[PDB]
User: Fold Erabutoxin c from Laticauda semifasciata.
Amino acid sequence: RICFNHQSSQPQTTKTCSPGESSCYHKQWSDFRGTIIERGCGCPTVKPGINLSCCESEVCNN
Amino acid sequence: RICFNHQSSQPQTTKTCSPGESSCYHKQWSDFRGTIIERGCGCPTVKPGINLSCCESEVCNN
Assistant:
């Protein structure tokens, strides 16, 4: 599985996930800077209020 | 939980999921006609070749 791992509006970067991993994630919140996005491999648990998205296809998390 | 349940780029419609359901889904594939989007409550099982995205927030599946 290949997942995007770039932050917010940065130039797109990718990461090859560890074997057995079939999910990519998109985590969004806000700070003084504006809209923040964290991307990676997997599907982590987030604190209430944080928007989370998980997908199961190559570079599905833009 | 409230999720979008409209197809492709058709007028937006939502659906009230059953209690306990915290997920919304976004499934995308391409038939002879091209890109097709399907939305709803939960996070269903999908066939290989169809891109599934599940999110956990109100009408998160646009």
